[PDB]
Design an enzyme around this catalytic site. Structure first.
Site, PDB file in Angstrom:
ATOM      1  CE1 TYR A  31      -3.985  -2.433   0.118  1.00 44.65           C
ATOM      2  CE2 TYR A  31      -2.288  -3.533   1.462  1.00 44.65           C
ATOM      3  CZ  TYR A  31      -3.609  -3.455   0.728  1.00 44.65           C
ATOM      4  OH  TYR A  31      -4.338  -4.344   0.512  1.00 44.65           O
ATOM      5  CE1 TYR A  73     -13.045  -3.632  -1.655  1.00 44.43           C
ATOM      6  CE2 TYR A  73     -11.502  -1.775  -1.381  1.00 44.43           C
ATOM      7  CZ  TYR A  73     -11.786  -3.053  -1.845  1.00 44.43           C
ATOM      8  OH  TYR A  73     -10.940  -3.799  -2.224  1.00 44.43           O
ATOM      9  CG  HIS A 112     -11.873  -7.217  -4.375  1.00 44.74           C
ATOM     10  ND1 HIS A 112     -12.521  -7.872  -5.592  1.00 44.74           N
ATOM     11  CD2 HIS A 112     -12.252  -5.908  -4.428  1.00 44.74           C
ATOM     12  CE1 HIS A 112     -13.143  -6.525  -5.930  1.00 44.74           C
ATOM     13  NE2 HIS A 112     -13.037  -5.817  -5.319  1.00 44.74           N
ATOM     14  CB  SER A 119      -8.145 -19.063   6.413  1.00 41.28           C
ATOM     15  OG  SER A 119      -7.523 -17.884   6.512  1.00 41.28           O
ATOM     16  CG  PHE A 123     -13.056 -14.196   9.145  1.00 43.37           C
ATOM     17  CD1 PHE A 123     -13.106 -14.370  10.369  1.00 43.37           C
ATOM     18  CD2 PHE A 123     -13.167 -12.858   8.425  1.00 43.37           C
ATOM     19  CE1 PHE A 123     -13.380 -13.212  11.155  1.00 43.37           C
ATOM     20  CE2 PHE A 123     -13.340 -11.937   9.257  1.00 43.37           C
ATOM     21  CZ  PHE A 123     -13.486 -11.878  10.643  1.00 43.37           C
ATOM     22  N   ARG A 141       0.356  -8.492  -9.424  1.00 45.96           N
ATOM     23  CA  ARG A 141       1.645  -9.125  -9.253  1.00 45.96           C
ATOM     24  C   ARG A 141       1.623 -10.290  -8.434  1.00 45.96           C
TER      25      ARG A 141
HETATM   26  C1  LIG Z   1      -8.948 -14.287   7.937  1.00 43.44           C
HETATM   27  C2  LIG Z   1      -8.639 -13.726   9.152  1.00 43.44           C
HETATM   28  C3  LIG Z   1      -8.475 -12.425   9.198  1.00 43.44           C
HETATM   29  C4  LIG Z   1      -9.314 -14.116  10.552  1.00 43.44           C
HETATM   30  O1  LIG Z   1      -9.040 -13.651  11.670  1.00 43.44           O
HETATM   31  P1  LIG Z   1      -8.967 -14.571  12.837  1.00 43.44           P
HETATM   32  O2  LIG Z   1      -8.619 -13.873  14.303  1.00 43.44           O
HETATM   33  O3  LIG Z   1      -7.876 -15.649  12.646  1.00 43.44           O
HETATM   34  O4  LIG Z   1     -10.465 -15.050  12.778  1.00 43.44           O
HETATM   35  P2  LIG Z   1     -11.179 -15.395  14.245  1.00 43.44           P
HETATM   36  O5  LIG Z   1     -10.221 -15.915  15.236  1.00 43.44           O
HETATM   37  O6  LIG Z   1     -12.114 -14.360  14.718  1.00 43.44           O
HETATM   38  O7  LIG Z   1     -12.257 -16.508  13.644  1.00 43.44           O
HETATM   39  C5  LIG Z   1     -13.469 -16.296  13.315  1.00 43.44           C
HETATM   40  C6  LIG Z   1     -14.054 -17.686  12.665  1.00 43.44           C
HETATM   41  O8  LIG Z   1     -13.933 -17.702  11.310  1.00 43.44           O
HETATM   42  C7  LIG Z   1     -13.701 -19.093  10.866  1.00 43.44           C
HETATM   43  N1  LIG Z   1     -12.222 -19.226  10.503  1.00 43.44           N
HETATM   44  C8  LIG Z   1     -11.103 -18.153  10.583  1.00 43.44           C
HETATM   45  N2  LIG Z   1      -9.979 -18.699  10.009  1.00 43.44           N
HETATM   46  C9  LIG Z   1     -10.291 -20.024   9.910  1.00 43.44           C
HETATM   47  C10 LIG Z   1      -9.522 -21.043   9.025  1.00 43.44           C
HETATM   48  N3  LIG Z   1      -8.108 -20.811   8.938  1.00 43.44           N
HETATM   49  N4  LIG Z   1     -10.092 -22.211   8.862  1.00 43.44           N
HETATM   50  C11 LIG Z   1     -11.320 -22.391   9.124  1.00 43.44           C
HETATM   51  N5  LIG Z   1     -12.265 -21.698   9.701  1.00 43.44           N
HETATM   52  C12 LIG Z   1     -11.792 -20.428   9.823  1.00 43.44           C
HETATM   53  C13 LIG Z   1     -14.202 -19.696  12.124  1.00 43.44           C
HETATM   54  O9  LIG Z   1     -15.400 -20.216  12.169  1.00 43.44           O
HETATM   55  C14 LIG Z   1     -13.748 -18.772  13.480  1.00 43.44           C
HETATM   56  O10 LIG Z   1     -14.275 -19.442  14.470  1.00 43.44           O
HETATM   57  P3  LIG Z   1     -13.795 -20.522  15.127  1.00 43.44           P
HETATM   58  O11 LIG Z   1     -12.270 -20.247  15.772  1.00 43.44           O
HETATM   59  O12 LIG Z   1     -14.671 -20.434  16.522  1.00 43.44           O
HETATM   60  O13 LIG Z   1     -13.850 -21.723  14.576  1.00 43.44           O
HETATM   61  C15 LIG Z   1      -6.824 -14.141   9.319  1.00 43.44           C
HETATM   62  O14 LIG Z   1      -6.765 -15.437   8.768  1.00 43.44           O
HETATM   63  C16 LIG Z   1      -6.022 -13.255   8.616  1.00 43.44           C
HETATM   64  O15 LIG Z   1      -5.496 -12.125   9.125  1.00 43.44           O
HETATM   65  N6  LIG Z   1      -5.827 -13.641   7.316  1.00 43.44           N
HETATM   66  C17 LIG Z   1      -4.858 -12.983   6.577  1.00 43.44           C
HETATM   67  C18 LIG Z   1      -5.211 -11.744   5.941  1.00 43.44           C
HETATM   68  C19 LIG Z   1      -6.451 -11.822   4.827  1.00 43.44           C
HETATM   69  O16 LIG Z   1      -6.073 -12.780   3.916  1.00 43.44           O
HETATM   70  N7  LIG Z   1      -7.394 -11.388   5.203  1.00 43.44           N
HETATM   71  C20 LIG Z   1      -8.485 -11.324   4.223  1.00 43.44           C
HETATM   72  C21 LIG Z   1      -8.471  -9.947   3.322  1.00 43.44           C
HETATM   73  S1  LIG Z   1      -7.017  -9.863   1.934  1.00 43.44           S
END
Ligand SMILES: CC(C)(COP(=O)(O)OP(=O)(O)OC[C@H]1O[C@@H](n2cnc3c(N)ncnc32)[C@H](O)[C@@H]1OP(=O)(O)O)[C@@H](O)C(=O)NCCC(=O)NCCS
Length: 155
Positions: A31, A73, A112, A119, A123, A141
């Protein structure tokens, strides 16, 4: 919330360096300085997330007027890998869903997700986001280039 080890905080010129650092590790796209200047101006729509008073995540959003709707967004929402599955994402997403609910004028919220981000899809679907589109070659990229558009209807 009570006894919770997770807390959200404001993004300020004092900790913005820390926000960029977090984003550089968590997100595959870089960014630019405009992103960071803009986040300092959206108020409650940008937050740092803390676990045991450690900055481990951040959420950054924007108000979008496209398709004749008022949209929220989510540009970035994420935390450091060792702290995942601890409720930090939920705290950040509930923060944004709560803003939209108090405001009352938003049509939807969307973002997006790279098609490979299983995961992230899991979520967001848990909160009622739906894949409404797969845009081919959205990302310049990184592999894979395709992205799902996930959306939650508010209206
Ligand atoms: C996606 C993301 C934000 C989730 O944050 P997190 O703190 O792990 O999420 P939470 O602890 O609040 O979990 C929320 C619920 O979502 C689901 N979930 C989250 N991650 C999961 C995984 N890896 N596999 C299956 N279910 C998942 C589950 O139901 C979970 O509840 P549970 O722990 O009781 O099973 C995290 O994986 C992340 O930082 N990803 C990288 C950045 C990214 O790509 N984000 C999206 C935009 S590009």
């Amino acid at each position: 919330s009570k006894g919770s080890r997770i807390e959200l905080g404001d993004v300020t010129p004092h900790n913005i360096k820390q926000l960029k650092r977090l984003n550089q590790v968590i997100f595959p796209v870089s960014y630019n300085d405009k992103f960071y200047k803009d986040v300092l101006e959206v108020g409650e729509l940008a937050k740092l997330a803390y676990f045991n008073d450690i900055a481990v995540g951040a959420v950054c959003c924007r108000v979008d007027h496209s398709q004749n709707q008022k949209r929220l967004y989510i540009m970035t929402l994420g935390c450091l890998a060792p702290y995942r599955r601890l409720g930090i994402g939920t705290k950040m997403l509930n923060h944004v869903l709560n803003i939209c609910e108090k405001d009352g004028t938003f049509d939807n919220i969307y973002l997006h997700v790279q098609i490979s981000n299983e995961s992230a899809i899991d979520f967001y679907r848990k909160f009622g986001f739906e894949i409404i589109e797969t845009k081919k070659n959205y990302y310049k990229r990184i592999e894979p280039a395709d992205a799902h558009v996930l959306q939650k209807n508010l209206k």
